[PDB]
Design an enzyme around this catalytic site. Structure first.
Site, PDB file in Angstrom:
ATOM      1  N   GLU A   1      28.087   5.120  -7.469  1.00  0.00           N
ATOM      2  CA  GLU A   1      28.941   5.961  -6.602  1.00  0.00           C
ATOM      3  C   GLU A   1      28.325   6.121  -5.209  1.00  0.00           C
ATOM      4  O   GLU A   1      29.085   6.246  -4.240  1.00  0.00           O
ATOM      5  CB  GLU A   1      29.163   7.317  -7.258  1.00  0.00           C
ATOM      6  CG  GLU A   1      29.921   7.226  -8.567  1.00  0.00           C
ATOM      7  CD  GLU A   1      30.216   8.587  -9.172  1.00  0.00           C
ATOM      8  OE1 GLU A   1      29.720   9.593  -8.627  1.00  0.00           O
ATOM      9  OE2 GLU A   1      30.939   8.645 -10.188  1.00  0.00           O
TER      10      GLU A   1
ATOM     11  N   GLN B   1       0.822  -1.227   0.000  1.00  0.00           N
ATOM     12  CA  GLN B   1       0.000   0.000   0.000  1.00  0.00           C
ATOM     13  C   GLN B   1       0.846   1.262   0.000  1.00  0.00           C
ATOM     14  O   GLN B   1       0.621   2.131  -0.853  1.00  0.00           O
ATOM     15  CB  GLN B   1      -0.927  -0.021   1.212  1.00  0.00           C
ATOM     16  CG  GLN B   1      -1.964   1.086   1.150  1.00  0.00           C
ATOM     17  CD  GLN B   1      -3.253   0.730   1.844  1.00  0.00           C
ATOM     18  OE1 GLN B   1      -3.311  -0.216   2.627  1.00  0.00           O
ATOM     19  NE2 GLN B   1      -4.301   1.487   1.560  1.00  0.00           N
TER      20      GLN B   1
ATOM     21  N   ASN C   1       3.861  11.713   0.425  1.00  0.00           N
ATOM     22  CA  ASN C   1       4.274  10.983  -0.790  1.00  0.00           C
ATOM     23  C   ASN C   1       4.857  11.943  -1.827  1.00  0.00           C
ATOM     24  O   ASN C   1       5.802  11.567  -2.533  1.00  0.00           O
ATOM     25  CB  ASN C   1       3.084  10.228  -1.360  1.00  0.00           C
ATOM     26  CG  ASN C   1       2.595   9.132  -0.441  1.00  0.00           C
ATOM     27  OD1 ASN C   1       3.229   8.817   0.563  1.00  0.00           O
ATOM     28  ND2 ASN C   1       1.464   8.542  -0.784  1.00  0.00           N
TER      29      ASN C   1
ATOM     30  N   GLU D   1      -3.786  -7.401  -1.958  1.00  0.00           N
ATOM     31  CA  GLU D   1      -5.200  -6.968  -2.017  1.00  0.00           C
ATOM     32  C   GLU D   1      -5.437  -6.182  -3.307  1.00  0.00           C
ATOM     33  O   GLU D   1      -4.537  -5.453  -3.780  1.00  0.00           O
ATOM     34  CB  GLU D   1      -5.555  -6.101  -0.816  1.00  0.00           C
ATOM     35  CG  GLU D   1      -4.736  -4.832  -0.678  1.00  0.00           C
ATOM     36  CD  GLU D   1      -4.819  -4.232   0.717  1.00  0.00           C
ATOM     37  OE1 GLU D   1      -5.510  -4.821   1.567  1.00  0.00           O
ATOM     38  OE2 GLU D   1      -4.191  -3.179   0.951  1.00  0.00           O
TER      39      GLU D   1
HETATM   40  N1  LIG Z   1       4.341   7.557   4.177  1.00  0.00           N
HETATM   41  C1  LIG Z   1       3.376   6.664   3.914  1.00  0.00           C
HETATM   42  N2  LIG Z   1       3.142   5.655   4.777  1.00  0.00           N
HETATM   43  C2  LIG Z   1       2.158   4.783   4.456  1.00  0.00           C
HETATM   44  C3  LIG Z   1       1.406   4.878   3.328  1.00  0.00           C
HETATM   45  N3  LIG Z   1       0.483   3.852   3.289  1.00  0.00           N
HETATM   46  C4  LIG Z   1       0.689   3.140   4.383  1.00  0.00           C
HETATM   47  N4  LIG Z   1       1.714   3.662   5.138  1.00  0.00           N
HETATM   48  C5  LIG Z   1       2.221   3.178   6.420  1.00  0.00           C
HETATM   49  O1  LIG Z   1       2.742   1.873   6.293  1.00  0.00           O
HETATM   50  C6  LIG Z   1       2.230   1.029   7.349  1.00  0.00           C
HETATM   51  C7  LIG Z   1       1.182   0.088   6.828  1.00  0.00           C
HETATM   52  O2  LIG Z   1       1.769  -0.780   5.863  1.00  0.00           O
HETATM   53  P1  LIG Z   1       0.876  -1.311   4.639  1.00  0.00           P
HETATM   54  O3  LIG Z   1       1.491  -0.890   3.345  1.00  0.00           O
HETATM   55  O4  LIG Z   1      -0.554  -0.898   4.786  1.00  0.00           O
HETATM   56  O5  LIG Z   1       1.016  -2.903   4.770  1.00  0.00           O
HETATM   57  P2  LIG Z   1       0.754  -3.865   3.520  1.00  0.00           P
HETATM   58  O6  LIG Z   1       1.944  -3.808   2.625  1.00  0.00           O
HETATM   59  O7  LIG Z   1      -0.535  -3.474   2.869  1.00  0.00           O
HETATM   60  O8  LIG Z   1       0.625  -5.313   4.202  1.00  0.00           O
HETATM   61  P3  LIG Z   1      -0.806  -6.045   4.372  1.00  0.00           P
HETATM   62  O9  LIG Z   1      -1.636  -5.241   5.333  1.00  0.00           O
HETATM   63  O10 LIG Z   1      -0.586  -7.436   4.887  1.00  0.00           O
HETATM   64  O11 LIG Z   1      -1.448  -6.084   3.012  1.00  0.00           O
HETATM   65  C8  LIG Z   1       1.667   1.993   8.379  1.00  0.00           C
HETATM   66  O12 LIG Z   1       2.686   2.447   9.248  1.00  0.00           O
HETATM   67  C9  LIG Z   1       1.165   3.136   7.514  1.00  0.00           C
HETATM   68  O13 LIG Z   1       1.197   4.327   8.261  1.00  0.00           O
HETATM   69  C10 LIG Z   1       1.641   5.929   2.424  1.00  0.00           C
HETATM   70  O14 LIG Z   1       1.013   6.078   1.391  1.00  0.00           O
HETATM   71  N5  LIG Z   1       2.658   6.823   2.759  1.00  0.00           N
HETATM   72 MG   LIG Z   2      -2.378  -4.338   2.498  1.00  0.00          MG
END
Ligand SMILES: Nc1nc2c(ncn2[C@@H]2O[C@H](COP(=O)(O)OP(=O)(O)OP(=O)(O)O)[C@@H](O)[C@H]2O)c(=O)[nH]1
Ligand SMILES: [Mg+2]
Ligand SMILES: Nc1nc2c(ncn2[C@@H]2O[C@H](COP(=O)(O)OP(=O)(O)OP(=O)(O)O)[C@@H](O)[C@H]2O)c(=O)[nH]1
Ligand SMILES: Nc1nc2c(ncn2[C@@H]2O[C@H](COP(=O)(O)OP(=O)(O)O)[C@@H](O)[C@H]2O)c(=O)[nH]1
Ligand SMILES: [Mg+2]
Lengths: 430, 442, 38, 343, 55, 442
Positions: B253, B10, B227, B70
């Site tokens: 480098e 995500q 982002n 997902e």
């Molecule tokens: N900076 C930033 N952090 C994000 C973002 N989306 C999620 N996070 C952070 O990343 C963590 C959640 O990880 P996810 O990416 O939702 O986990 P996942 O890869 O979907 O893993 P699953 O839930 O098993 O599908 C939390 O600490 C969120 O705050 C984003 O778009 N930007």
């Molecule tokens: Mg997820």
């Protein structure tokens, strides 16, 4: 990711009618079944709760079971009753008699096979099946006995899916039936082995919500079932709408359950406010967060201040900042640190979804795992021991065929559940 | 010449949306993959080639994969505005998530999806003539990012071998938190990541929230702001491959200059002219002011204080209107400061880069338009503090086997917890030993 | 059980000296100096 | 007094920022009982200018579609902000448009005189347009006026349409809009002409004259134009622009060190001004010499004593306010034309 | 948490017990969670933010 | 910036109706709580913020609570014209009155209602960012005003601490009287008000009746006239917080300038241009004439003669079209007068304030429209005569225990009467001692 719902008994059928009304309203489905919505966001996840029938129609993935057809004729006569598939109504010819043994052993084994055929027919149609959702009362007769029978069979046939239950449990003050302790004790014994997640609701808490928060002058069961349908429809919102931080029932279970027996949770829904007051206070994340932890808005008679939170989850709906959620959950954890179990470094999970429920700018539903739930089971066990020592009404159950050893086993299992919660309440780092 | 981007889960896909929006707007590719009819004339140019390939009819398509278990986030990219830019094969989605379990991603679910990912990466690598590395974006807090990211990096490391892999990683913030099981996933991810990554950049949302409150005037920020800042950082680091400059810096480098020993590859990152449009026109923004800005910890995008440690190497990338004499004067002034300290075995601590292209402005953005910027990635012993708090949280939770039954049921041996915790203990001791003064041997 | 006033709902700044989860780190450094001498 | 419930007029306004290259939107409030102004930001509800007194403003100045000078900057009033100002400022802001044909340029001065100081029309939009035949047909110019230059004027007065019809009947040659859609199309015409005007460029035998705002407030612009035409010049070019202090400084930089009242002269060019460009069809006529002879000495008292028939002896009040600014060298024509007419 | 235990003989109009809430409830009608109606749902964050940039 | 209003009992709630009517009419808020439709332009100003808060839909709601033990007056507010202005939670009502017993309000009935009131005040104080004091309106002649006012001031003083508490108090008139037991309630109330208030304003109904008969031409005045005059005074004192001006005065400046010693905090109040429309057109109203008027005993709203004492401090608030040089010339003329005397230890006896907003005219009102007004609050030793006459009536009644059995039955020890009488005796002696010249004491 499709959910199959099962509604059993009078309470289950009545709550189900309002739940399917709320779900049909948010997706704009007419009581004739026609889609009349106004945004593609509604259509793209309609599959989650509805199957598509030919020429436009949608049918709801639900099985209705009861031992006397009176309730089914009432739900078929209701305003949305037509949407339900006729073949999905299963009924017998004689009532449960408020007796657990009849519902589990005599009419249960007679009807259960037709229910399993319908549940398998519904499950095998999904391209990918998510967990089941069941609504029933534990104090009744067919709800407790036949619901737990069906739960055991579905756990045998689908052990890798999730099993989720919403359950009504007898108030300590407002009893509706004399033999409530037996039916409740046997049902809790079945649930603690079979269930993955169980939610408990007290009718006294819904009356206190209506009178104190909503100030309703003459509440009716339709209001209580609307509050329950609102909270039930809210937990699944992230499964079926886009959002900044998606969530899922399995992810909720993984963050909420530390140990497999500790799967009993408290429920709450935040934006509750009377029609006179609503003009005086705007919605914002601090107001929802303040109401969400107020015990007035929590749906069981046990109070959180007498226990400790092991874990909690909050699902937010609406266009809102993630910073305010994170800082609110940090502030509540820091100022009330004594009410949170210290050997877990962060007890609250947050989730954010873009689409709020219709007519509200934002909403949150709260699920809590708190040790104060031990107080309800202790009260049921005391009333059971008072009745059991004197064989107060036991001849009915023994005449149906139950051995006395089941009652001693169910009592022992409930006592061990209370002991395990009590041990984690008083645990320490050392 | 070319670089391939791998986005996982995500955070990685949402950061990818901001990155590709920026790379399109800076090169001038429209959201449908074409360019305006008057932008074709002029001198013959190809700088986009590092990130885009042309079919011959003039459509551009990007060298990236988006990986998720997902469907929701990938279905949102598929139904959004950039639908025609991506190749449909590039957007890969599974059926169900890893539910915050590293074990579910690594053992049970990622093993089915991993072969499609390797086939797509192979199809990209066959259409290149100067591949110079893999860029990876993921979060270590979630289940699929940790488990599938580790499994895929292991397979890539076996098949492609020596090619470099640079990671941008979102670690769990020190007091803001989102899920209960974050320590287990971060420890188990870091165990696999130690062997199979050349440089790892660490980010914390709490730092970018602090930066957006102090410098910009935003009271209620959301992930799109963070982002877009990350996208600006990536654009600054990759600008050295794409535009003319006085001192260019190839992607090899960074790895050669920043990593002294093969396990000591975790670096801190910061960005200087974070400023609002209303403040930008009352003040000059000279080289020395932004150079002084990059060293205060209030400017950093990771929550660590470098005054409690020693720097081993710094890489400073300048883009825009800068002259080398001002960079030399600034670095000599920084070297004079008493609150900046280098380990005594690293006397020549700096690498510089100078590029002529100024940073691009995005229509909905919150940063002002500025003629020059500097971005820094640096290796410092202060990072040892980040691992110690996660390790302490793991020890607190693991003392009572708080959630272990999920991991053991989903396919993992209990022994794997002890192995990972012992490896992180050895990494902490490595950072303790490397920071020991060589003086006073007699 | 009080959430406190609205003006005190903001983010507290991070101070790693008073972080409860880093005390063994500082104790380790204080032991490490004498360990290096010996 | 300084009460908060005192009567006022409210507008939305625009002002271009030459430093940030950005457009800003404000809300302007004018308390006409005591001549004070306050300005607030629309975007973030921020105060911009505290309630302060300005003695050079009047109630008649504030009209929709007009422009004002405030502390050296130009501000444009295009809105109504509440219903009270719609009631008060209505009935005196109806918009009509008047077009002029080729045969009546030699009498354009009397045309503007009868338009302004006798028919009661006060107007700030005035440009000369040359259109191709198809575009002219599409926009809806009269058929008899095609193939020629046309001057479109956007007037404002009470009962604009009927008074415009009366003006049509009073003096022949002119044409006026008879409906709202005609007004809209002619406004589109004047805007399109503003995007690219018509004039002669690069001609060494040319002259540009600017008419000061205080001359216009006395309704003397038409007489000045007619007197300039009478001397033997042919009009080629007309405009109505608002120039800021930076534009005035850039136009008047060579004079730095000649005029003894330079900052006061710079201030006199702020506001609505007319721009005139004159050429001669005979090669034996030097336009700059005749223009300067007609304009007269730049000191109004000297002009009154020595050249009693001059323009400045007729309409000047002081050295800073001499009612005309004209080119004084034989090379300034192309430069002034390039400044005032090149897009 | 306690339940009301008072029997109100009179109707709303007589200033005893819950006259204000009774008046409001008889004014509006049935009970719904929704406050306003006939308002479109907002778009997602990705759709609102990442639009087509100006050329 | 913000101020919270607490209204107690019958006089305090009825004066509150006039106050909120005036504040609404001055800002332009309609009784429903919204600005007029023909005056909503899109943006507005913060001056209302001192007394109103917006929800977000643009409705205004006021920062006040109405407290009473009998329902009738609050039920009149609930059923009156301003039903939609107040939040229903703010209107708190009990079941039965305190029956003119301070003991019944303090001990028996107010103890049940006080905690709900404190919860409401706490809920208001949490929705503020610059609260700078409490304004309290009550009468000390009645039972609930004395008893519950004292109990609530004690609890507020413990919970909020340093925050200022300014009281407007209606004391028993010297010959007009309404109840027999007024002296007892006023003595026991005054005992509590001495310890827990920063400034106390004194009012007598006989003075406002005399002022309305002599200056206005009203032969048969009623309480609505008095309440409108009190509202004008409160609007004059609070104007310094709400509108632009040459010399502003914050509520903390009153306590520093008016109170010389911590017990000497009882002040007299007066207002100058109380005049009818028919007299107003025969006379000019310059600064010096109204400045001379506020010092004449015909202008005061309390029945005391300042010629029997010496002034310690005066605070003069001018509102409307006034220029500072005229205020200086007027104050310099006052100092020359021989019938105005200041204590020799107070050489700089005056504080000035100048605000541009002229006084508002209420549609059904009896005051004329005028360009300027001045309001004065002053500290003077003459107030000692007011306490001595109440003490004499107390001594006459207490010599025979005329009504004490009610108070002892409702829960009070007979000893409490003697303690309060000794505290008022000590306050009288303080006013005797503070006024003694240093030249005689050497
Ligand atoms: N900076 C930033 N952090 C994000 C973002 N989306 C999620 N996070 C952070 O990343 C963590 C959640 O990880 P996810 O990416 O939702 O986990 P996942 O890869 O979907 O893993 P699953 O839930 O098993 O599908 C939390 O600490 C969120 O705050 C984003 O778009 N930007
Ligand atoms: Mg997820
Ligand atoms: N100026 C003015 N005086 C008032 C008003 N109402 C009552 N008073 C005076 O205040 C005294 C009576 O105090 P009350 O307010 O009636 O006492 P209470 O607060 O109702 O106390 P309880 O009788 O126990 O309920 C008498 O001197 C009245 O003349 C009013 O509206 N305006
Ligand atoms: N909240 C709620 N409770 C209900 C409803 N209908 C029945 N109950 C409760 O459920 C219990 C009766 O159980 P019942 O459904 O009749 O059991 P069954 O005979 O096995 O179906 C009593 O405590 C009722 O008060 C309903 O619509 N809503
Ligand atoms: Mg009373």
């Amino acid at each position: 990711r499709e959910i199959v719902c099962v509604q059993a008994g009078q309470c289950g059928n009545q709550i189900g009618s309002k739940f399917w009304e709320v779900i049909s309203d948010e997706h704009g489905v007419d009581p004739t079944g026609t889609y009349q919505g106004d945004s593609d966001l509604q259509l793209e996840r309609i599959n989650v709760y509805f199957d598509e029938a030919t020429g436009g129609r949608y049918v709801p993935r639900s099985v209705l079971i009861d031992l006397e057809p009176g309730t089914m004729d009432s739900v078929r006569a209701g305003p949305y009753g037509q949407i339900f598939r006729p073949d999905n109504f299963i009924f017998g010819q004689s009532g449960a008699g408020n007796n657990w043994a009849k519902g589990h052993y005599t009419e249960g084994a007679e009807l259960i096979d037709s229910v399993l055929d319908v549940c398998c027919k519904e499950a095998e149609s999904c391209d990918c099946l998510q967990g089941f959702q069941i609504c029933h009362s534990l104090g009744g007769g067919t709800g407790s006995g036949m619901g737990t029978l069906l739960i055991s069979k579905l756990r045998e046939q689908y052990p890798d899916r999730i099993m989720m239950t919403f359950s009504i449990i007898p108030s300590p003050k407002v009893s509706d039936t004399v033999v409530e302790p037996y039916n409740t004790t046997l049902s809790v014994h079945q649930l603690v082995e079979n269930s993955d997640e169980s939610m408990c609701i007290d009718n006294e808490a819904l009356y206190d919500i209506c009178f104190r928060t909503l100030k309703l002058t003459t509440p009716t069961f339709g209001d209580l079932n609307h509050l329950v349908s609102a909270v039930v429809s809210g937990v699944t919102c992230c499964l079926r709408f886009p959002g900044q931080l998606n969530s899922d029932l399995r992810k909720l279970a993984v963050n909420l359950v530390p140990f497999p027996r500790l799967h009993f949770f408290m429920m709450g829904f935040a934006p509750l406010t009377s029609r006179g007051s609503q003009q005086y206070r705007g919605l914002s994340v601090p107001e929802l967060t303040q109401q969400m932890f107020d015990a007035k808005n929590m749906m069981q008679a046990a109070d959180p201040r007498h226990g400790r939170y092991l874990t909690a989850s909050a699902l937010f709906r609406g266009r809102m900042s993630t910073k305010e959620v994170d800082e609110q959950m940090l502030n509540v954890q820091n100022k009330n640190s004594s009410y949170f179990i210290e050997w877990i470094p962060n007890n609250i999970k947050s989730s954010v979804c873009d689409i709020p429920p219709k007519g509200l700018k934002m909403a949150v539903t709260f699920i809590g795992n708190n040790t104060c739930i031990q107080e309800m089971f202790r009260r049921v066990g005391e009333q059971f021991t008072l009745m059991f020592r004197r064989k107060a009404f036991l001849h009915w159950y023994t005449g149906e065929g139950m051995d006395e050893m089941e009652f001693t086993e169910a009592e022992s299992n409930m006592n061990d559940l209370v002991s395990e919660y009590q041990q984690y309440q008083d645990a320490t780092i050392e | 010449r070319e670089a391939i981007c791998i986005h996982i889960g995500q955070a990685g896909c949402q950061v990818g949306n901001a990155c590709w929006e920026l790379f399109c707007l800076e090169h001038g590719i429209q959201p449908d993959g074409a360019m305006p009819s008057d932008k074709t004339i002029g001198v013959e140019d190809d700088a986009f080639n590092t990130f885009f390939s042309e079919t011959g009819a003039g459509k551009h398509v990007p060298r990236a994969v988006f990986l998720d278990l997902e469907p929701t986030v990938v279905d949102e990219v598929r139904t959004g505005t950039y639908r025609q830019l991506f190749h449909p094969e590039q957007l890969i989605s599974g059926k169900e998530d890893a539910a915050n379990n590293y074990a579910r991603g690594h053992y049970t679910i990622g093993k089915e999806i991993v072969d499609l990912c390797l086939d797509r990466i192979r199809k990209l690598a066959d259409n290149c003539t100067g591949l110079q590395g893999f860029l990876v974006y993921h979060a270590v807090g979630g289940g699929t990012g940790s488990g599938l990211g580790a499994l895929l990096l292991e397979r890539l490391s076996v098949d492609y071998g020596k090619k470099s892999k640079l990671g941008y990683t979102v670690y769990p913030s020190p007091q803001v938190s989102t899920a209960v099981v974050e320590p287990y996933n971060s420890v188990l991810s870091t165990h696999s990541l130690l062997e199979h990554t050349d440089v790892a950049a660490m980010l914390d949302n709490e730092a970018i929230y602090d930066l957006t409150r102090r410098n910009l005037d935003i009271e209620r920020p959301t992930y799109t702001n963070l982002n877009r800042l990350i996208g600006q950082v990536v654009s600054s680091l990759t600008a050295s491959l794409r535009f003319d400059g006085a001192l260019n810096v190839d992607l090899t480098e960074f790895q050669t200059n920043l990593v002294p020993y093969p396990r000591i590859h975790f670096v801190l990152t910061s960005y200087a002219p974070v400023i609002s449009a209303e403040k930008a026109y009352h003040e000059q923004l000279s080289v020395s002011e932004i150079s002084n800005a990059v060293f205060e910890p209030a400017s950093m995008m990771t929550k660590c204080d470098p005054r409690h440690g020693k720097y081993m190497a710094c890489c400073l990338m300048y883009r825009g209107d800068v002259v080398p004499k001002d960079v030399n004067a600034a670095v000599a002034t920084i070297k004079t400061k008493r609150t900046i300290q280098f380990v005594d075995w690293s006397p020549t601590g700096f690498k510089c880069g100078i590029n002529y292209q100024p940073p691009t402005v995005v229509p909905g953005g919150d940063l002002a338009k500025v003629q020059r910027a500097v971005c820094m990635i640096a290796n410092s012993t202060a990072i040892a503090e980040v691992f110690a708090r996660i390790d302490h949280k793991f020890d607190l939770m693991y003392s009572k086997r708080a959630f272990v039954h999920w991991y053991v049921g989903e396919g993992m041996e209990e022994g794997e917890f002890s192995e990972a915790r012992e490896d992180l203990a050895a990494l902490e001791k490595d950072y303790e030993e490397v920071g020991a003064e060589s003086a006073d041997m007699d | 059980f009080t959430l406190g006033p609205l003006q005190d709902q903001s983010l507290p700044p991070y101070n790693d000296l008073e972080d409860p989860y880093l005390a063994p780190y500082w104790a380790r450094r204080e032991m490490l100096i004498r360990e290096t001498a010996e | 007094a300084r009460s908060l419930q005192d009567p006022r007029l409210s507008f939305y306004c625009e002002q271009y920022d030459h430093i940030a290259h950005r457009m800003n939107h404000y809300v302007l409030q004018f308390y006409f009982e005591d001549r004070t102004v306050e300005i607030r930001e629309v975007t973030k509800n921020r105060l911009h200018l505290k309630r302060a007194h300005f003695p050079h403003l009047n109630r008649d100045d504030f009209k929709v579609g007009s422009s004002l000078s405030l502390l050296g900057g130009v501000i444009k009033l295009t809105a109504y902000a509440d219903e009270v100002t719609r009631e008060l400022c209505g009935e005196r802001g109806e918009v009509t448009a008047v077009m002029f044909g080729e045969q009546l340029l030699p009498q354009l001065g009397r045309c503007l005189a009868v338009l302004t100081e006798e028919c009661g029309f006060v107007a700030l939009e005035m440009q000369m347009a040359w259109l191709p035949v198809e575009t002219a047909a599409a926009y809806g110019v009269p058929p008899d006026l095609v193939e020629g230059r046309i001057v479109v004027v956007k007037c404002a007065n009470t009962n604009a349409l009927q008074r415009g019809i009366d003006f049509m009947a009073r003096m022949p040659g002119a044409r006026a809009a008879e409906s709202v859609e005609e007004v809209g199309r002619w406004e589109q015409i004047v805007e399109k002409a503003k995007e690219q005007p018509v004039a002669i460029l690069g001609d060494p035998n040319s002259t540009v004259v600017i008419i000061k705002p205080h001359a216009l407030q006395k309704l003397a612009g038409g007489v000045i134009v007619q007197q300039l035409i009478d001397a033997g010049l042919e009009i080629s070019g007309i405009s109505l622009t608002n120039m800021t202090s930076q534009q005035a400084n850039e136009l008047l930089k060579p004079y730095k060190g000649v005029l003894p009242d330079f900052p006061d002269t710079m201030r006199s060019l702020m506001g609505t001004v007319w721009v005139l460009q004159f050429v001669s069809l005979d090669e034996g006529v030097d336009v700059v010499s005749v223009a300067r002879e007609v304009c007269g000495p730049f000191d109004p008292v000297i002009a009154k004593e020595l050249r009693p028939t001059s323009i400045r002896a007729r309409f000047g009040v002081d050295r800073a306010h001499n009612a005309v600014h004209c080119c004084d060298l034989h090379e300034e024509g192309p430069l002034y034309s390039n400044f005032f007419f090149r897009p | 948490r306690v339940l009301p235990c008072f029997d109100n003989h009179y109707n709303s109009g007589v200033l005893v017990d819950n006259w204000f809430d009774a008046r409001i409830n008889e004014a509006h009608g049935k009970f719904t969670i929704a406050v306003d109606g006939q308002s479109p749902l907002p778009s997602s964050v990705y759709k609102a933010d990442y639009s087509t940039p100006c050329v």
